[PDB]
Design a protein around this nucleic acid. Structure first.
Lengths: 51, 167, 106, 196, 214, 23, 119, 18, 125
RNA sequence: GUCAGCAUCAGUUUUCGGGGGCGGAAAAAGAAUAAGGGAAGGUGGCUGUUUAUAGCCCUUGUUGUAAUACGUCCACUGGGGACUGAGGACUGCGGCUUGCCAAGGAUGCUGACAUAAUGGU
RNA sequence: CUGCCGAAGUUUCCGGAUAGCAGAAACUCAGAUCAGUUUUAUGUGUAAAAUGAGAGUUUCUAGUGGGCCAUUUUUGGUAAGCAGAACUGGCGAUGCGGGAUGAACCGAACGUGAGGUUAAGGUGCCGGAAUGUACGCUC
C-alpha cells in the first residue's frame, strides 16, 4: 500500500481523497460591491502626516 | 528598498502606570521587523524603556504625500566614528523622503565608510524655500535657468563601426 | 547556394564544472543570436548535434554525428546546457555544433 | 551574437587589458583573431608610470645565462600577445592551440588592409576611461623601450591611408550612383510599407 | 458489506462539514480582525492584534561546530538536520529557547497556506515509530482518533489554531524535511535577520522563505 | 610588488599580525 | 527487467600498476596515513557494499540467465525445469565427445549453452 | 486580542537626541 | 553642443518598460534624475534616470513643473507629434519596428520587391 | 535484438504568462472639475510685482464604490524544457456514473537498423 | 575480503586499583521515569510547568589515563614579549566545497547513482557564473 507518494496539490484526484470538501470551496467572493466607506479618523491622518 | 514606518509603542500597563504614554517615531527600515527592532533600540537608548517590559501598539507604512513634486530635504544625523561621536546636517534634492534617506545612506557609506548601525537618523525635514537652502550644489540646481550637457553617456561584441559617443 | 542551413549555429564551450571538478555528462553550449536566459527558453528542447569526420567509410559515409538535446539555460549570457547521447570529447571545446529547429513549437 | 572564420580587430583606441580579455575568450571559443594596428593600443595611467612598469619588467633576469631568463619583447604586437597569453591556459594543449589561432601585427599588412576591421565596444578608451584621465600609447612606450620601427610604420601607414582613401572615394562615387538609381525605380516606393 | 460503506460515507460527509466549519472560522477571524482595525483607525484608536500562539522553526545551521548547550535544545526541538521545519507552541517557555538558538535557527508566524501546504506535501506521520506519509485520512484517524482528529483538515486546524491537542498533533508530525530554498538565502546567511542576514526571528517572512522551500 | 616589496605576506606572518592585532 | 551494473571497472589493489610484485588483486590498505583509505581526491575507489547490484538481477548474465556449471549429460537433465532461469556452462575439462553430447541434450531440452561452440 | 483607548492618551512623537 | 538637459526638451526612453516612447522633461531633479511626462495615456508622469533616455534635438516651450494636462495641451499646440516623425531618425526607427513585426510571408514579398528593384541597375554611360 | 520519434499519463523539478478575490491613508498619486489660500527658481506685462497674452504651490469639494502600485490568497487557469517508469492477477482510498477514470509506481502509436546501432575490452 | 557496533583521550585514591566512556548476559519496568534544555515559585542555589525521549538498574570485559590550538574571565604584568590558572570549544578516530597553495579560517560532516536546489566563496580572462544595475570616493 502506498508504493508512490502523490502530491495532493498537483493531483486533483488525491486532493479529493484527502479533503472531501474541495469539490465546493468558492475561493473568490465579491464583498466590496457596496459604497466603500473611507474609514480613517481625522486625528489619525494628522498623526500619520505628522512632523 | 527602504520603507518609511510610523511606529507607536508603550510599556505594559501596570498599577504604577495604568496609562503609559504612547511614544511615536518616524523611522526608516526595509521591513516591519527591522523597523520595530530599531524603534525598541532607540526607545531604550533615549527614554530607557525596556523592550521586555514594552509592547508595540501601532505600526503603519507612510507613503510620500506628493511623490511627483521635486523637493529638497535636510537631514540631521549622529554618525559614529573612531571616536563614535559626530553630528552633521546634509541636504538632498529628490522627489521622495525615502529617496533622500536612500541617498544619505549611500553617501555616508561611500565617504566615511559608515554602516546602517553606525548611522542613526535624528530628524528629517522638507526645506521648501530657496532662502533656507544652504548647499551650493542644491542652489545651483534650483537656479531658474538650469541646463547642462548630459555627462557619462556611455551582447553583440565586435561592433563594425566606431561609436558616435556624442550627439 | 544559400538555400540550406535549416539549423542554428553553436559552439561547445566547455563542460559543466566547478573550479576544480568537471562533469562531462552535461556540456555548456553557446547558441549564437541568443543573448539571455529568456532568449534561451526558446531553444530549450531543441536538437543539437555534433558533426565530425572519420577515416573509415562506415555505411559508405565519411561523416558521423553525435546527437544531443538542449536541457536548460546556463548563466545570464544565454548559454545552454546540452545532454548528448555520448558525452562529447574534450577535444571539441570550441568546435561547432548544429542546433536544429525541431521539435518545434512555433 | 555571431562569429566569422577570421575576425580582424582594429586596435586603435582600444585598451590593452580590455581587448586582450575579449580576445582570449574568443580564441578559447574557437575563433581565429587577427589584431592589427597593435602599436595604437592604449594603457591606463600616464606614460611615465607605464614606462617604469616595463622597465621594472626588464629587471626580471637570472644571474646564470640571462638568455635563460624572461625574454623581454619590445614590439607592440609582442606586448599585446604577452597580455593575451597570460589570460590563456598556455601550459596545456588547449591553451597552445588558442595562441596559434591569433596573429597580432603592427600596422595593417596588405592581406588585412583590404578586409573589414571590426572594433570591440567593451575595450574602447573613449567609453572606458573617464575624460581627462591619463593614458599612454603602446607605440610610444615601445619606441622608448627599444622598438626601432616606429618611423617606418608611421610612413607605411600614411601610404595605406592615402591608398585606402582613394578607394573609398571610388566606392562613394559608385554608392552615389546606386543611391540615385535606388529611388528612381517607382517599385521602391510602391510597397515600401514593409519598412525597406 | 453495506454497513462499512454507509459508515464511511457518513464519515466522509462529517469530515466535509468540519472542513466547511473550519474554513468559515478562518474567514470570519480574518474579517473580524480587519473590521476591528478599520474601526480603530476610524475612531483614531489603536488596536493590538493578539499574540501568535503558533510558530514555525527552520534549522539553518548544520551539525558541525555547535556548542553542546545549543545542541541539546535542537535535540529537544527535533531539529536534527539542516533545513528541517517544525511547529512550536509559541509561549513564554519557548521564547527563551528560541532566543538562545537565535544564530542557528529561523522562525516566524506561518499563515494558513504555509501550514496547509506543508502537511499536504511534506506531511508525514509518526506511526509506530515510522515515517508514514499522510496519504489518506484513515492513517490520521487510527493514530489520533482519541483526540477527535479524523482528516488532514482536522490536523491542519489543530495545528493552525493551536487547539487543546496541539502537543499531540505536533508530536505526530514528523519534522518536515524541506529542500534548499529556491533562489537561495541572502548573500550572508548567518547574520541576524534584522542586520541583513537570514537567522533568527523574522515574523511574517517565514512564509516567503517556506514557499521557496516547497 | 612593483614598488620594492611584495604585498603578499607569509602565512605565519599573517597569523602573528592577527595575534598582534588581538593584543 | 533489464540488468544494470552499478560498476564496470574492477577494483585494483593500490600501486599494483607500479609494482609487478604487487598483484592487482584487491587488498584493503591498513596504512594509518594511507590517503587512499582516507578517500582523498584523485585517488582510486574502494570496494563498498553500496556497489552491490540488484538482488533480482544479481549473478545474471547480460542475456538474463544464470550460468550453471555442467560436466555431463546427467547435469543438463537437472536444468530441465529452469531453462528460462539457468544457462548451462560446460566445464573446461570436458572432452570433445562429451561436449557434443551435452550440447545436443541441452538443445533438445531447450537449455541454453553459454560456450557451445568450443572443442 | 484586546482594545486600547487613546482617549486622553494622545501619542507623543519622539525622535532621538544627539 | 546641440542637446542640453533643460525643461521643455523632448526625450526618447531607451531602457525600461517604456522603451521607444517619447517624453518631455517637465522638471529637473538633479544631475542624475529627471521628471518626465508624455501626452499618451499609456505613459504616466514619472521620474527617470538620465541613462534611460536619449536627448532629442526637438525642444518645445514649456513652463517649469506643468501638470500633465497642460503638458499635453502644449504638446498639441506646438505639434510635437509628427514633428519628431519629420526627422529622418524617427523614420528609421519606425521602419525598423515595421521590419521587426514582419512575418515570413512578408519577408518573401520583400525579396521579390528588392529583386525587382535590383532588376534595373541601369545608369547613364 | 539494438536504437530512435511522438502522444496520453504518474513522480520530482524548473521557467514564462493570463484571470480573479482581499488588504493599506478601504494605497499614496493622478486626471477632470468647483471654492479659498499662497507665492515663486516672476510669465505676460511694468530691478520691482501676483495670472493677465505662461503657469506653479497649499487646502477643500467633486468626478469615486476612480485607477494603479504593492502585500496577500485562489481546493483559478494557459504553455515551454529536463530527469525518472521502481512495482507486476484481483483487493484499498476516491471520482464520474453495471461500468469508466489522471484513483495503492507506463503505457500506447509507430519507425529505422542488423554488412550497425548499443554495450563493452 | 566484506559487514556491523565503537571509544577514552582523565577524574578520584595508593605501576596499579577505582570511577567515567563502549559492549555483552540476565532481570523490572510503559497510570515510568529520565534530560549537557528552557520556564514558574521560594529564598546564585532550592523546589514544581514546557519540550524531547520508553525509561531503569545488577553482574563482567575489553580499550583509554596524552597533548595541541583557540575563546572568555582573571592573576601579575613587561622596555616589548609574555607568564599563571579556570572555562568550554576545535583537532584529535574525518574525507568534502571555498580561502591561489596550507594541522588548526569560512561552510559542510561521507553507501553506489540520476535530477533539482543551495552553503561558504564567487561571476574581466586563466575559471563554472552579469565587462550586471544604482550612488559615491580615489590618480
Amino acid at each position: 500500500a502506498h508504493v508512490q507518494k502523490k502530491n495532493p496539490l498537483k493531483n486533483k484526484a488525491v486532493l479529493s481523497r484527502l479533503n472531501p470538501y474541495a469539490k465546493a470551496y468558492k475561493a473568490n467572493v465579491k464583498i466590496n460591491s457596496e459604497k466603500t466607506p473611507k474609514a480613517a479618523g481625522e486625528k489619525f491622518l494628522s498623526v500619520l502626516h505628522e512632523n | 528598498a527602504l520603507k518609511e514606518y510610523q511606529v507607536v509603542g508603550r510599556k505594559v500597563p501596570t498599577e504604577h502606570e495604568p496609562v503609559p504614554k504612547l511614544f511615536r517615531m518616524r523611522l526608516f527600515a526595509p521591513n516591519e521587523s527591522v523597523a520595530k527592532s530599531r524603534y525598541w533600540y532607540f526607545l531604550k537608548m533615549i527614554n530607557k524603556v525596556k523592550k521586555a517590559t514594552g509592547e508595540i501598539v501601532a505600526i503603519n507604512e507612510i507613503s510620500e504625500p506628493k511623490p511627483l513634486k521635486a523637493k529638497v530635504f535636510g537631514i540631521w544625523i549622529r554618525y559614529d566614528s573612531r571616536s563614535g561621536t559626530h553630528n552633521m546636517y546634509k541636504e538632498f534634492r529628490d522627489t521622495t523622503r525615502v529617496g533622500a534617506v536612500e541617498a544619505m545612506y549611500a553617501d555616508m557609506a561611500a565617504r566615511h565608510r559608515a554602516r546602517f548601525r553606525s548611522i542613526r537618523i535624528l530628524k528629517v525635514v522638507e526645506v521648501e524655500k530657496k532662502e533656507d537652502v544652504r548647499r551650493n550644489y542644491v542652489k545651483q540646481l534650483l537656479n531658474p535657468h538650469l541646463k547642462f550637457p548630459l555627462p557619462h553617456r556611455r551582447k553583440k561584441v565586435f561592433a563594425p563601426h566606431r561609436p558616435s559617443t556624442f550627439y | 547556394a544559400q538555400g540550406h542551413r535549416l539549423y542554428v549555429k553553436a559552439k561547445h564551450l566547455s563542460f559543466q564544472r566547478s573550479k576544480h571538478v568537471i562533469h562531462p555528462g552535461t556540456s555548456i553550449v553557446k547558441i549564437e543570436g541568443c543573448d539571455s536566459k529568456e532568449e534561451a527558453q526558446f531553444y530549450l528542447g531543441k536538437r543539437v548535434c555534433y558533426v565530425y569526420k572519420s577515416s573509415k567509410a562506415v555505411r559508405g559515409s565519411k561523416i558521423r554525428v553525435i546527437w544531443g538535446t538542449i536541457a536548460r539555460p546556463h548563466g545570464n549570457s544565454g548559454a545552454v546546457r546540452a545532454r548528448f547521447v555520448h558525452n562529447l570529447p574534450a577535444k571539441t571545446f570550441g568546435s561547432s555544433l548544429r542546433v536544429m529547429l525541431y521539435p518545434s513549437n512555433i | 551574437s555571431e562569429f566569422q572564420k577570421v575576425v580582424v580587430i582594429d586596435a586603435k583606441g582600444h585598451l590593452l587589458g580590455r581587448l586582450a580579455s575579449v580576445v582570449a575568450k574568443q580564441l578559447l571559443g574557437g575563433q581565429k583573431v587577427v589584431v592589427v594596428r597593435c602599436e595604437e593600443l592604449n594603457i591606463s595611467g600616464h606614460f611615465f608610470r607605464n614606462k617604469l612598469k616595463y622597465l621594472a619588467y626588464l629587471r626580471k633576469a637570472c644571474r646564470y645565462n640571462p638568455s635563460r631568463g624572461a625574454f623581454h619583447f619590445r614590439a607592440p604586437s609582442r606586448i599585446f600577445q604577452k597580455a593575451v597569453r597570460g589570460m590563456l591556459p598556455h601550459k596545456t594543449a588547449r591553451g597552445q592551440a588558442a595562441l596559434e589561432h591569433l596573429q597580432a601585427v603592427e600596422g595593417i599588412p596588405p592581406p588585412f588592409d583590404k578586409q573589414k576591421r571590426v572594433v570591440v565596444p567593451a575595450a574602447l578608451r573613449v567609453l572606458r576611461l573617464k575624460p581627462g584621465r591619463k593614458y599612454c600609447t603602446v607605440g610610444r612606450l615601445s619606441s622608448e623601450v627599444g622598438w626601432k620601427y616606429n618611423d617606418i610604420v608611421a610612413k607605411l601607414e600614411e601610404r595605406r591611408k592615402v591608398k585606402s582613401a582613394a578607394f573609398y572615394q571610388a566606392k562613394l562615387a559608385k554608392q552615389k550612383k546606386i543611391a540615385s538609381a535606388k529611388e528612381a525605380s517607382p517599385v521602391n516606393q510602391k510597397l515600401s510599407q514593409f519598412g525597406y | 458489506a453495506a454497513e462499512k460503506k454507509s459508515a464511511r460515507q457518513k464519515k466522509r460527509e462529517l469530515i466535509a462539514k468540519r472542513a466547511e466549519a473550519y474554513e468559515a472560522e478562518y474567514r470570519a477571524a480574518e474579517r473580524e480582525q480587519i473590521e476591528l482595525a478599520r474601526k480603530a483607525r476610524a475612531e483614531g484608536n489603536y488596536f493590538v492584534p493578539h499574540e501568535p500562539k503558533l510558530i514555525f522553526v527552520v534549522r539553518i545551521r548544520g551539525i558541525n561546530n555547535i556548542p553542546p548547550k545549543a545542541r541539546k535544545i535542537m535535540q529537544l526541538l527535533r531539529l536534527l538536520q539542516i533545513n528541517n521545519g517544525i511547529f512550536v507552541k509559541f509561549n513564554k517557555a519557548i521564547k527563551e529557547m528560541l532566543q538562545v538558538v537565535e544564530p542557528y535557527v529561523t522562525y516566524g508566524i506561518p499563515n494558513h497556506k504555509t501550514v496547509r501546504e506543508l502537511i499536504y506535501k511534506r506531511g508525514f506521520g509518526k506511526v509506530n515509530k515510522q515515517r508514514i506519509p499522510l496519504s489518506d485520512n484513515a492513517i490520521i484517524e487510527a493514530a489520533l482518533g482519541k483526540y477527535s482528529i479524523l482528516s488532514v483538515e482536522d490536523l491542519i486546524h489543530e495545528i493552525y489554531t493551536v487547539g487543546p491537542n496541539f502537543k499531540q498533533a505536533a508530536n505526530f508530525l514528523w519534522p518536515f524535511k524541506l529542500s534548499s530554498p529556491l533562489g537561495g538565502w541572502r548573500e550572508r546567511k548567518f547574520k541576524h535577520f534584522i542586520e541583513g542576514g537570514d537567522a533568527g526571528k523574522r515574523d511574517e517572512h517565514i512564509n516567503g522563505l517556506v514557499q521557496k522551500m516547497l | 610588488s612593483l614598488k620594492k616589496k611584495s604585498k603578499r605576506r607569509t602565512t605565519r606572518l599573517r597569523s602573528r599580525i592577527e595575534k598582534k592585532a588581538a593584543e | 527487467v533489464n540488468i544494470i551494473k552499478k560498476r564496470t571497472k574492477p577494483f585494483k589493489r593500490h600501486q599494483s600498476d607500479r609494482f609487478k610484485r604487487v598483484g592487482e588483486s584487491w587488498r584493503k590498505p591498513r596504512g594509518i596515513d594511507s590517503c587512499v583509505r582516507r578517500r582523498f581526491r584523485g585517488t582510486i575507489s574502494m570496494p563498498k557494499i553500496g556497489y552491490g547490484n540488484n538482488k533480482k538481477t544479481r549473478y545474471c548474465m547480460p542475456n538474463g540467465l544464470k550460468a550453471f556449471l555442467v560436466r555431463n549429460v546427467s547435469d543438463v537433465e537437472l536444468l530441465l525445469m529452469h531453462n528460462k532461469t539457468y544457462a548451462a556452462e560446460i566445464a573446461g575439462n570436458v572432452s570433445a565427445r562429451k561436449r557434443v553430447e551435452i550440447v545436443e541434450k541441452a538443445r533438445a531440452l531447450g537449455v541454453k549453452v553459454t560456450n557451445a561452440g568450443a572443442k | 486580542a484586546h482594545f486600547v483607548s487613546t482617549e486622553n492618551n494622545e501619542p507623543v512623537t519622539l525622535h532621538p537626541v544627539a | 553642443f546641440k542637446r542640453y538637459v533643460e525643461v521643455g526638451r523632448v526625450v526618447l526612453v531607451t531602457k525600461g518598460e517604456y522603451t521607444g516612447k517619447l517624453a518631455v522633461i517637465v522638471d529637473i531633479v538633479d544631475h542624475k534624475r529627471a521628471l518626465i511626462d508624455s501626452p499618451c495615456s499609456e505613459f504616466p508622469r514619472q521620474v527617470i534616470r538620465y541613462g534611460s533616455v536619449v536627448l532629442t534635438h526637438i525642444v518645445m516651450k514649456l513652463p517649469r513643473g506643468a501638470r500633465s494636462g497642460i503638458v499635453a495641451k502644449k504638446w498639441k499646440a506646438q505639434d510635437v507629434c509628427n514633428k519628431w516623425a519629420s526627422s529622418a531618425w524617427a523614420k528609421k526607427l519606425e521602419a525598423k519596428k515595421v521590419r521587426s513585426q514582419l512575418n515570413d510571408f512578408d519577408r518573401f514579398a520583400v525579396m521579390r520587391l528588392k529583386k525587382q528593384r535590383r532588376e534595373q541597375v541601369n545608369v547613364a554611360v
